[PDB]
Amino acid sequence: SQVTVAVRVRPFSKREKTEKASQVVFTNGEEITVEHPDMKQVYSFIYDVSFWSFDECHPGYASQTTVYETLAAPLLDRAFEGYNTCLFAYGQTGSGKSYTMMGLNEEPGIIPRFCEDLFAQIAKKQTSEVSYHLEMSFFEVYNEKIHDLLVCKGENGQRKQPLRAREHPVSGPYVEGLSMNVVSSYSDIQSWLELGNKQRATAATGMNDKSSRSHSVFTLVMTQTKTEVVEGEEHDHRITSRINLVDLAGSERCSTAHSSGQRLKEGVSINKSLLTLGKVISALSEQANGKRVFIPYRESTLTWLLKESLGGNSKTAMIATVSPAASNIEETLSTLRYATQARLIVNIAKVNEDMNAKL
Amino acid sequence: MREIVHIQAGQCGNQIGAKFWEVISDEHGIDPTGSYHGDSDLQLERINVYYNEATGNKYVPRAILVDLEPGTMDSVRSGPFGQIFRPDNFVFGQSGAGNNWAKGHYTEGAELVDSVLDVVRKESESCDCLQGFQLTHSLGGGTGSGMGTLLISKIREEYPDRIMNTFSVMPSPKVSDTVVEPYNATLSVHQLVENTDETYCIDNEALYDICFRTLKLTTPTYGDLNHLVSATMSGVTTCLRFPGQLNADLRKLAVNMVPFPRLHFFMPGFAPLTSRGSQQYRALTVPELTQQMFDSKNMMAACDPRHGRYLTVAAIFRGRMSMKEVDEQMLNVQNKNSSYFVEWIPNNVKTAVCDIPPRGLKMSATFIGNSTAIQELFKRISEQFTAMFRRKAFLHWYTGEGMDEMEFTEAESNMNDLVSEYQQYQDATAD
Amino acid sequence: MRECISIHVGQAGVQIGNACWELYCLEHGIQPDGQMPSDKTIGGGDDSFNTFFSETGAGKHVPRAVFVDLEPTVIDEVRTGTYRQLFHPEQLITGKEDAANNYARGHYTIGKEIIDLVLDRIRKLADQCTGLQGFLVFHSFGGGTGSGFTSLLMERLSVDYGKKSKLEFSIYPAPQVSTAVVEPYNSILTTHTTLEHSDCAFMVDNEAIYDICRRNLDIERPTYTNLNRLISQIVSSITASLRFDGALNVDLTEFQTNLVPYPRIHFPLATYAPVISAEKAYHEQLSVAEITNACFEPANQMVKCDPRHGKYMACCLLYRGDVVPKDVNAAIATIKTKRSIQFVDWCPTGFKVGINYQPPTVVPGGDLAKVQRAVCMLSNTTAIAEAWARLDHKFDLMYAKRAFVHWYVGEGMEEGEFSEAREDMAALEKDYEEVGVDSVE
Ligand SMILES: CC(=O)O[C@H]1C(=O)[C@@]2(C)[C@H]([C@H](OC(=O)c3ccccc3)[C@]3(O)C[C@H](OC(=O)[C@H](O)[C@@H](NC(=O)c4ccccc4)c4ccccc4)C(C)=C1C3(C)C)[C@]1(OC(C)=O)CO[C@@H]1C[C@@H]2O
Ligand SMILES: Nc1nc2c(ncn2[C@@H]2O[C@H](COP(=O)(O)OP(=O)(O)OP(=O)(O)O)[C@@H](O)[C@H]2O)c(=O)[nH]1
Ligand SMILES: Nc1nc2c(ncn2[C@@H]2O[C@H](COP(=O)(O)OP(=O)(O)O)[C@@H](O)[C@H]2O)c(=O)[nH]1
Ligand SMILES: [Mg+2]
């Protein structure tokens, strides 16, 4: 495949410049290295892509708009060609994933560029011969239960109404009673997302406030309606396309972080989901390289949502944020270790004894 | 200290209880009066694994019955050990199902679940600690699947860490003692695979082959088969109850046998078993047992292992022994038939030992195995299904009480996917 | 004067104690209950030696030990069996839950609610110990509590007490045999947690003693106890220096020094040469030369580790009985003359020695037979690395296919811990692969 997991880095901060957190990550460009103040042991990690965004003037700079144009063309291509596409994000507090996905009002992130270029190509191609009808949904996962984020809550406690996941034989996984809305301006989805992020839950762990205890899924359906018949007005088909984005938590060592009660349950569920996702992605690259093999789809709930949006003619990717703080090193290392199994070379052997090239 | 609960539904579960508690009472030394008549000072040291206390130094099981039709529970009350149970724990109703799943999951099971919890919580909170829950049920019946599956769903929604074991029954290939075994058992297998740590899939016909060919009994009844299922359920927990040179529990078995969470459909076995007038010509030694176990004539599925492979096994021994012999035999077995076992797992077995065997034996062993021969049980089930759903044969019954075709399709999809997971590993799997 | 706290953990630890204390009581001539009828025969002195056993004004004694298993099926024997009224009633047996043959329960969910009590009792034992609290942990890999709980306890004691002698007579899996299927995952992380905090950690393998059971003492149907007694005689062959008078006495502070060149390579092996039967106790001299020859042979080693594939970083010895240091020197020089052995250039000395006059003592109806002298050996080699190098090939497949995993994180563990541990072990292999080269420049 071309799943093409990629990595980015946070230039430190002015606050971190006050403390002068010693640089740990060295970069040669294409490869990535790392050190440790013991200064004996060493690691070295490879990836398809490297966004060395720390330095401002170094060659091969990693710009936000450059991050967009790196991965945006396959999205619009694989969509307008009719197929579906997802995007996974991974990282934690200190890596500033929000800075990457959403950016700021002035500093444009990823989502806004995507939706705005989408609207651009929409209004550009909006002939009389075509209609583009796009709709939205936003939900979260919590202790392995689904909850709708978009719901305007009623007068009640916060019994976040648990929907369920069911299966059509035709298109497969979906949810009953999943609320949807419509998109005709970037500002509308901005407001929807701004409110949806509010109900997604965090908690003041030993680290800080906004350590999410849930996985946040964003889904867009696009309806492409161009089909027109020579005999008369008959739309013989209306193409559907699924675009997906998701933001996830870290990995949350409960060993050092001795937090008990209900936070442990949340962390355990999150870790199980992350495990299943890594296994799924391993099976993906194993399957698009010449070996038919099962997929452990049905283990989690999230993955059970995506068995069509992450298989067959579905080209997706993962992005990994980090920060080179000395007080983050383990977490930093852990992040990279979650992803590298998607490497193309995992020591595949060679065998060939078929010999009937005759006639 | 550790404690265990038992649930029963349908005719099979009640009738299996009437033999299992009738066996455990003689193992720990209890009588139909709920009273003690044993000899040691040991059988009463860990009896609290199952049983509660009393007033006149009697003892009581923490057993529960579910069944909707009283026409079976009465057979207990007019039974040998049918007046020890707390009569409140004989939860029942009326209006039997009709061998229907929908009438036991949706209409009345969904009605009666609260009344059953009214006893379940009472017995569960009395325990100082907890280890897990049991079930003893079957598929092809009514209440024995629907009400019990609903129970398991709710209970796991409550207790995400405690264990739930279901020593169930699955139907046979050749004879179908009930017509619509496939639909009911399929719905159960859907609502079980995600809501269970381990289930001990057991089949009728292997027991028949045993009682006809091996023990050379002439004419057995269902009692004489539940008399083996009970010993199967009993040698498992002997580690937990009685001491040993290497202890165990339910957790170590379920964890050292369920690598992947869905892949938890097991295959049992028992050793020693011989004809009444033929155990003169043998020896009660580990080699005889390990040779008699892995053969395809002591399991309980009638499902060909040599047609497949084993992911892992577990063997819980009972007696004065020498663990060196166990280890050497196990290494020899892994060495000889090594193709039958897996490449991508280096060692494929653990052990568990007790120094206290049953009342009349010197050496025993219970076998557990996570295999792939459970395939054909399920390919066959799905085939008998898709031969019926292809034309909506018996469907309108299950729908008229408020189902849809969508659920049936979901169950089929999940079964086929688990089947393909099992088929992932059956081939050579080399380089 | 000088004492040694002894903790035993897991069923392995508890059974090993059930052997070891039954040895120690017979050595000093001590009843089960705690009195000294041997002293009633003698009538005075320090013979009820305070290195292990504390004493009271009423006359009763008690060892300075504890044990914990998290499985009350085991020790409730010891609360009721023959040796019941000896030990301190504080044995922490909060075995509400078992350790599931997993390292997550032993170190985080079931690793709590006890460890505070354990350290509290270690304090309540130490403040009357008027010498070193040289710690002994008799734990095991594979087994549940003795991995995780031990990893927690030793790392905590490193912060509490620190500059002391902490030893682990751990138990290692045989490369083929097991009573488990996830034994490596429960064996590898305790190495990552011991490599910084424990000072020295001896090792054994059950398969090696199982092979001993038939070649030498002519038995083929052993229990576990018949190995626990070998372990007990090993520990006696160590402790008998501090315990009784001797010619060349050795303290536990010596073993940590003369066999730990580098901090991380502190994983030696152990042997006991005369393992011979009452019949075969006759028919032969048991002179010192042949004994010390058996103290380097491959068979009688307590581990499947062929040292001829590696080299010797160091070797220590502890002798017993009627012994002559000139005979010892002759044996040592005889052993240094062989081309079948390759000591490294940076350990030309090789040998440390220590002697105690009092030989071992027979135990009724057991296996071994009374003799006039005995020997124990310890050794830090470079061949054991291969055994560790086996586990990576017994690890990596499973962690690659991600088998037997989800039952860990269900109790709070992260997966990255594996990899961050894995390469650590890999680095350790390099150290055992690095020093074994006779450097020139
Ligand atoms: C002289 C002698 O050998 O007595 C045996 C006996 O004859 C045989 C046939 C027993 C007997 O079992 C059978 O032959 C049998 C009959 C019908 C259906 C299935 C089996 C026995 O019932 C089995 C029983 O041993 C037991 O299994 C335990 O007592 C058993 N408890 C009960 O079954 C029980 C049932 C109702 C009321 C009270 C006790 C048990 C087994 C495992 C775990 C816990 C308990 C004993 C001594 C015998 C008889 C009685 C003939 C054997 O039983 C087993 C599997 O252990 C069959 O082979 C063994 C040993 C003997 O060969
Ligand atoms: N050499 C030796 N090894 C032993 C002995 N007893 C137990 N073991 C090993 O210890 C392992 C299990 O130890 P435990 O931790 O006590 O297992 P457990 O009794 O279930 O206790 P937990 O695992 O902590 O729950 C087994 O696999 C054995 O290989 C012994 O007496 N001698
Ligand atoms: N193996 C076994 N199966 C039984 C026994 N009693 C009943 N059954 C099973 O029960 C099924 C019949 O359905 P049943 O459970 O009686 O329906 P219900 O009780 O009304 O829910 C059959 O498949 C039988 O195999 C028994 O003693 N042994
Ligand atoms: Mg245990």
Side-chain angles (χ1 to χ4, degrees):
Chain A
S1 188
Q2 302 278 254
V3 302
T4 59
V5 183
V7 185
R8 206 179 150 223
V9 187
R10 171 55 158 104
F12 287 23
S13 167
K14 61 181 70 56
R15 167 154 194 288
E16 273 61 359
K17 276 170 93 82
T18 297
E19 296 182 350
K20 316 178 188 169
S22 176
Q23 185 209 323
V24 310
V25 178
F26 286 22
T27 68
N28 77 326
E30 78 294 32
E31 311 164 273
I32 293 160
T33 54
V34 55
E35 292 184 8
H36 186 284
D38 72 338
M39 295 284 150
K40 163 52 155 72
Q41 63 197 344
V42 56
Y43 314 130
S44 67
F45 300 143
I46 309 291
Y47 280 130
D48 302 358
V49 169
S50 67
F51 283 9
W52 175 232
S53 183
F54 174 34
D55 189 287
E56 301 82 19
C57 292
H58 183 281
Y61 181 86
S63 311
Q64 318 290 93
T65 311
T66 295
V67 174
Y68 180 85
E69 190 173 358
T70 308
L71 308 174
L75 322 187
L76 184 65
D77 284 26
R78 184 73 75 181
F80 273 45
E81 288 178 352
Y83 307 158
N84 309 286
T85 296
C86 302
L87 192 149
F88 305 143
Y90 183 40
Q92 66 280 14
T93 317
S95 82
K97 284 183 88 189
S98 52
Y99 194 95
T100 306
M101 297 292 102
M102 289 258 286
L104 303 178
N105 47 294
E106 195 279 307
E107 278 286 359
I110 289 160
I111 296 142
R113 301 169 193 265
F114 184 82
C115 302
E116 280 216 323
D117 213 323
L118 193 67
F119 275 127
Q121 295 286 358
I122 287 158
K124 170 264 196 193
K125 304 173 147 285
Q126 265 306 289
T127 81
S128 51
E129 327 196 334
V130 61
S131 178
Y132 284 178
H133 182 194
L134 273 59
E135 44 264 17
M136 182 265 288
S137 63
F138 197 54
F139 47 79
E140 69 91 3
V141 187
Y142 187 48
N143 306 264
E144 203 67 44
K145 309 297 197 290
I146 296 166
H147 297 323
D148 190 313
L149 289 168
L150 185 135
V151 158
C152 279
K153 193 186 84 174
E155 68 96 11
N156 44 39
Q158 194 60 270
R159 202 295 312 283
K160 221 177 274 191
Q161 170 46 61
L163 290 174
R164 221 189 312 106
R166 294 179 68 189
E167 209 190 353
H168 211 274
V170 171
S171 47
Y174 80 106
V175 169
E176 56 161 65
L178 169 46
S179 306
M180 300 147 66
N181 298 82
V182 193
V183 309
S184 66
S185 87
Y186 157 68
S187 294
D188 308 306
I189 57 185
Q190 276 292 114
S191 185
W192 278 123
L193 183 69
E194 185 268 310
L195 300 184
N197 283 107
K198 194 188 292 180
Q199 286 280 10
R200 180 186 178 190
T202 54
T205 320
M207 322 203 171
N208 216 329
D209 179 46
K210 297 182 300 319
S211 195
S212 57
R213 301 297 90 206
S214 289
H215 286 325
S216 73
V217 163
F218 180 24
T219 297
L220 298 181
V221 180
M222 158 158 46
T223 318
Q224 170 167 1
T225 297
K226 182 177 178 182
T227 314
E228 288 206 359
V229 158
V230 75
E231 195 279 336
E233 80 301 329
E234 161 51 27
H235 308 326
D236 284 327
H237 64 266
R238 37 167 61 90
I239 287 149
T240 60
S241 294
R242 300 192 82 82
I243 290 155
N244 273 318
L245 304 162
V246 72
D247 186 72
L248 306 164
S251 58
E252 285 74 32
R253 292 263 213 81
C254 205
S255 316
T256 46
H258 49 82
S259 46
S260 66
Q262 208 168 314
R263 306 292 86 71
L264 165 148
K265 183 170 72 176
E266 293 165 337
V268 166
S269 61
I270 291 155
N271 279 109
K272 275 186 167 182
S273 184
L274 174 75
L275 182 62
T276 297
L277 170 52
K279 271 207 296 204
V280 167
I281 293 169
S282 67
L284 293 180
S285 42
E286 279 162 289
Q287 178 148 19
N289 222 37
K291 307 185 160 37
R292 181 192 58 73
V293 163
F294 203 71
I295 295 160
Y297 277 126
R298 284 146 173 286
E299 167 52 9
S300 79
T301 306
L302 168 53
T303 305
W304 178 243
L305 318 170
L306 309 183
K307 154 169 172 293
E308 194 79 340
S309 66
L310 210 63
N313 55 42
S314 62
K315 204 56 55 177
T316 78
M318 188 146 56
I319 192 169
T321 63
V322 309
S323 180
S327 84
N328 291 354
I329 296 158
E330 305 99 325
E331 297 94 334
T332 312
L333 295 155
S334 292
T335 296
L336 305 174
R337 292 180 209 291
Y338 156 74
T340 310
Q341 275 301 132
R343 185 68 175 72
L344 303 172
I345 73 188
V346 193
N347 182 228
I348 309 310
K350 71 176 191 175
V351 73
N352 204 4
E353 64 172 3
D354 58 58
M355 210 58 45
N356 306 120
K358 322 205 168 182
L359 288 68
Chain B
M1 295 295 293
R2 285 158 295 194
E3 295 208 19
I4 277 164
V5 182
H6 192 128
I7 306 310
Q8 315 190 358
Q11 190 178 4
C12 84
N14 304 6
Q15 187 58 238
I16 289 154
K19 180 72 56 165
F20 158 79
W21 302 94
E22 150 153 14
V23 155
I24 291 282
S25 44
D26 203 327
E27 161 64 72
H28 289 77
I30 315 292
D31 76 333
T33 312
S35 199
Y36 176 84
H37 286 261
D39 67 338
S40 83
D41 269 359
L42 177 47
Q43 297 152 87
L44 300 154
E45 176 162 1
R46 294 277 167 286
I47 200 177
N48 296 22
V49 164
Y50 287 104
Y51 292 7
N52 266 345
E53 305 301 336
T55 80
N57 314 275
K58 306 310 206 193
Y59 288 105
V60 166
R62 286 193 304 289
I64 287 154
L65 282 71
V66 170
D67 189 7
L68 308 172
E69 44 266 43
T72 308
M73 288 185 183
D74 61 341
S75 66
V76 185
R77 291 181 179 173
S78 170
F81 296 93
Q83 74 300 347
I84 59 181
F85 294 83
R86 202 178 292 121
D88 295 329
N89 297 334
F90 282 174
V91 177
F92 63 89
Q94 288 102 324
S95 70
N99 300 122
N100 180 311
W101 181 98
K103 281 207 208 310
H105 207 263
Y106 282 27
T107 51
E108 303 291 352
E111 175 272 344
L112 206 69
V113 71
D114 292 331
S115 299
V116 166
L117 292 181
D118 187 74
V119 182
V120 180
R121 300 182 180 286
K122 278 191 197 96
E123 285 282 16
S124 171
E125 177 49 58
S126 312
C127 318
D128 57 346
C129 204
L130 184 59
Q131 194 175 331
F133 298 146
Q134 277 189 164
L135 177 64
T136 297
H137 82 97
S138 299
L139 311 174
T143 313
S145 162
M147 179 53 197
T149 45
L150 194 81
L151 277 176
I152 285 156
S153 173
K154 302 301 206 205
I155 294 155
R156 191 169 198 71
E157 197 267 317
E158 302 208 340
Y159 298 172
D161 41 357
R162 308 289 86 76
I163 294 158
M164 176 52 93
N165 217 321
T166 64
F167 293 174
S168 315
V169 178
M170 326 300 274
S172 172
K174 204 69 63 54
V175 64
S176 46
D177 293 331
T178 301
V179 174
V180 309
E181 291 158 13
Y183 286 178
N184 288 23
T186 296
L187 293 178
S188 189
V189 163
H190 156 257
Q191 215 153 37
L192 185 78
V193 72
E194 308 296 344
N195 286 15
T196 292
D197 300 357
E198 76 192 359
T199 191
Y200 283 48
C201 318
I202 295 155
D203 194 359
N204 277 121
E205 272 190 27
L207 306 173
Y208 287 94
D209 188 81
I210 285 157
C211 303
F212 165 81
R213 198 205 81 81
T214 300
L215 301 173
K216 291 177 172 19
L217 254 183
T218 80
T219 50
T221 178
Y222 277 11
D224 277 0
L225 282 72
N226 306 290
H227 177 289
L228 284 180
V229 170
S230 62
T232 308
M233 167 149 77
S234 165
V236 161
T237 65
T238 301
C239 61
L240 170 56
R241 302 172 266 176
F242 311 152
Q245 311 315 292
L246 182 58
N247 300 10
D249 64 344
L250 271 170
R251 197 102 65 172
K252 289 161 50 158
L253 302 164
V255 173
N256 308 313
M257 298 291 284
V258 181
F260 295 182
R262 278 155 64 97
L263 292 165
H264 63 310
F265 288 11
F266 281 27
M267 265 195 198
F270 195 90
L273 304 163
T274 35
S275 113
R276 168 175 305 289
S278 320
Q279 58 65 34
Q280 193 71 6
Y281 305 163
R282 294 209 82 188
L284 316 186
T285 63
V286 176
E288 299 275 318
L289 306 202
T290 54
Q291 190 268 296
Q292 200 210 346
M293 284 159 73
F294 293 6
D295 179 285
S296 52
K297 303 291 256 193
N298 293 253
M299 305 282 273
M300 306 187 148
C303 293
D304 295 316
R306 298 166 293 177
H307 280 159
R309 277 216 200 70
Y310 285 172
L311 281 172
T312 176
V313 309
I316 296 150
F317 285 34
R318 308 179 50 165
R320 286 280 180 108
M321 319 180 284
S322 173
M323 269 64 76
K324 188 185 165 291
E325 209 183 351
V326 176
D327 297 18
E328 288 215 33
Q329 291 291 308
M330 285 270 158
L331 272 182
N332 294 316
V333 169
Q334 285 175 341
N335 273 307
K336 195 179 277 155
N337 298 21
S338 303
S339 77
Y340 289 2
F341 291 0
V342 170
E343 289 84 341
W344 57 269
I345 309 174
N347 198 329
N348 300 331
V349 58
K350 77 174 280 297
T351 58
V353 173
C354 168
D355 202 350
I356 301 293
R359 174 78 73 197
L361 277 184
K362 273 180 204 287
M363 193 182 286
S364 171
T366 42
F367 173 89
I368 284 151
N370 185 6
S371 83
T372 65
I374 201 81
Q375 268 173 9
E376 288 286 295
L377 182 62
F378 286 20
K379 270 179 209 177
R380 179 168 71 267
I381 280 159
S382 52
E383 196 74 355
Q384 275 164 47
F385 186 97
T386 188
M388 291 177 59
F389 198 98
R390 181 70 187 170
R391 296 183 76 192
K392 318 194 191 270
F394 280 52
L395 176 52
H396 64 72
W397 275 98
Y398 286 152
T399 64
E401 313 315 287
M403 298 189 74
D404 203 311
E405 315 190 351
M406 196 182 177
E407 190 158 17
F408 280 46
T409 306
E410 275 146 18
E412 171 158 25
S413 73
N414 205 343
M415 183 92 70
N416 293 116
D417 292 318
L418 176 63
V419 163
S420 177
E421 173 57 24
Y422 274 102
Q423 181 59 8
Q424 185 56 65
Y425 306 166
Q426 196 100 327
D427 65 281
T429 74
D431 204 347
Chain C
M1 312 301 273
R2 61 216 180 288
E3 319 183 339
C4 310
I5 282 164
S6 288
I7 311 185
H8 328 307
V9 181
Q11 205 173 332
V14 171
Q15 302 279 345
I16 285 159
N18 267 354
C20 283
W21 305 111
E22 181 258 322
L23 185 61
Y24 277 107
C25 287
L26 302 165
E27 268 172 355
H28 295 54
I30 302 191
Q31 267 285 294
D33 70 333
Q35 306 264 35
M36 298 298 295
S38 63
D39 181 29
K40 299 185 149 173
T41 314
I42 291 161
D46 68 339
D47 305 356
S48 90
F49 275 119
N50 59 62
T51 310
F52 284 53
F53 292 10
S54 76
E55 190 172 3
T56 55
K60 191 172 169 189
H61 289 54
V62 71
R64 65 198 55 266
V66 303
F67 35 79
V68 308
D69 67 338
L70 324 184
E71 48 194 349
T73 304
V74 175
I75 296 155
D76 272 29
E77 289 182 347
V78 184
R79 273 168 172 165
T80 59
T82 185
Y83 283 126
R84 67 188 183 277
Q85 68 254 20
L86 184 58
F87 289 9
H88 197 264
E90 202 86 34
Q91 296 143 1
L92 281 162
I93 311 156
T94 304
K96 301 301 195 183
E97 194 162 333
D98 210 38
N101 311 139
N102 84 318
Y103 169 103
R105 273 177 177 109
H107 192 186
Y108 324 114
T109 79
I110 315 303
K112 304 174 164 293
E113 301 95 43
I114 315 186
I115 188 66
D116 288 351
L117 312 193
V118 188
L119 292 175
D120 289 330
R121 273 281 185 290
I122 284 154
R123 273 199 305 283
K124 262 189 180 68
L125 274 159
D127 294 64
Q128 57 271 57
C129 166
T130 69
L132 76 157
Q133 290 73 348
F135 294 162
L136 292 191
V137 189
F138 301 160
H139 71 90
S140 71
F141 306 129
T145 308
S147 51
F149 200 63
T150 291
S151 75
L152 182 65
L153 184 44
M154 295 284 283
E155 72 174 351
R156 284 274 284 269
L157 292 165
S158 88
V159 173
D160 309 325
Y161 297 173
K163 295 155 160 203
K164 328 286 165 286
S165 65
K166 303 183 278 286
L167 306 179
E168 292 185 350
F169 295 0
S170 179
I171 292 154
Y172 193 89
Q176 294 273 51
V177 190
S178 162
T179 58
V181 311
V182 300
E183 196 167 5
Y185 294 176
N186 196 17
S187 187
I188 203 175
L189 307 171
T190 306
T191 47
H192 175 278
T193 315
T194 45
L195 196 64
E196 289 288 316
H197 309 328
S198 63
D199 297 333
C200 188
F202 305 163
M203 284 169 57
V204 307
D205 274 329
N206 277 327
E207 158 164 352
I209 320 304
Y210 280 141
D211 275 333
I212 285 161
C213 285
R214 51 170 196 69
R215 188 196 283 87
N216 297 3
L217 69 162
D218 288 297
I219 310 183
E220 49 263 21
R221 268 70 164 170
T223 65
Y224 269 45
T225 64
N226 301 117
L227 318 178
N228 298 127
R229 294 208 153 113
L230 275 293
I231 290 278
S232 288
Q233 285 270 279
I234 292 281
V235 180
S236 185
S237 307
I238 284 158
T239 58
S241 171
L242 302 165
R243 285 188 280 129
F244 296 173
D245 185 288
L248 290 152
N249 64 340
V250 166
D251 191 296
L252 297 178
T253 54
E254 311 195 15
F255 301 135
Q256 43 179 15
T257 304
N258 302 111
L259 299 161
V260 184
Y262 286 22
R264 287 154 61 79
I265 67 178
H266 61 288
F267 280 88
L269 299 164
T271 82
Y272 177 77
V275 286
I276 201 160
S277 278
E279 293 90 299
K280 284 199 193 148
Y282 306 161
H283 296 285
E284 178 56 47
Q285 278 272 33
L286 315 188
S287 297
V288 183
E290 53 170 350
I291 292 164
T292 294
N293 271 113
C295 298
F296 293 93
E297 278 193 356
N300 306 319
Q301 281 275 12
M302 294 172 74
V303 160
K304 302 292 291 197
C305 181
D306 188 10
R308 305 195 275 209
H309 302 152
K311 292 187 178 130
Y312 277 27
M313 292 197 275
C315 59
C316 176
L317 295 171
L318 298 166
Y319 284 19
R320 308 281 288 284
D322 172 73
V323 186
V324 187
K326 176 255 281 179
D327 295 345
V328 174
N329 279 337
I332 288 151
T334 304
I335 290 280
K336 273 162 80 73
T337 317
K338 279 178 189 311
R339 315 286 68 72
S340 71
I341 296 166
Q342 297 82 19
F343 281 32
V344 301
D345 57 337
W346 49 266
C347 275
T349 64
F351 293 68
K352 177 73 176 190
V353 189
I355 275 161
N356 180 0
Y357 297 93
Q358 174 49 72
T361 180
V362 75
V363 180
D367 302 339
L368 276 65
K370 172 159 59 144
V371 302
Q372 51 269 21
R373 59 188 71 78
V375 170
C376 180
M377 176 268 260
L378 289 161
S379 52
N380 200 340
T381 80
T382 66
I384 197 69
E386 154 164 16
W388 279 331
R390 192 171 295 107
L391 289 197
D392 311 285
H393 202 85
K394 208 170 270 155
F395 188 109
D396 288 4
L397 302 162
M398 298 151 82
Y399 173 81
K401 291 187 187 294
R402 295 279 201 269
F404 306 103
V405 195
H406 71 74
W407 278 121
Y408 275 24
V409 305
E411 309 289 327
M413 167 66 85
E414 190 173 294
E415 86 298 358
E417 170 88 58
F418 294 164
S419 296
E420 285 284 352
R422 165 55 167 102
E423 66 205 349
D424 203 341
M425 184 57 67
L428 195 75
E429 159 168 358
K430 306 306 300 222
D431 306 338
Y432 279 32
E433 198 168 11
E434 198 155 317
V435 309
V437 187
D438 213 313
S439 55
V440 176
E441 289 277 351

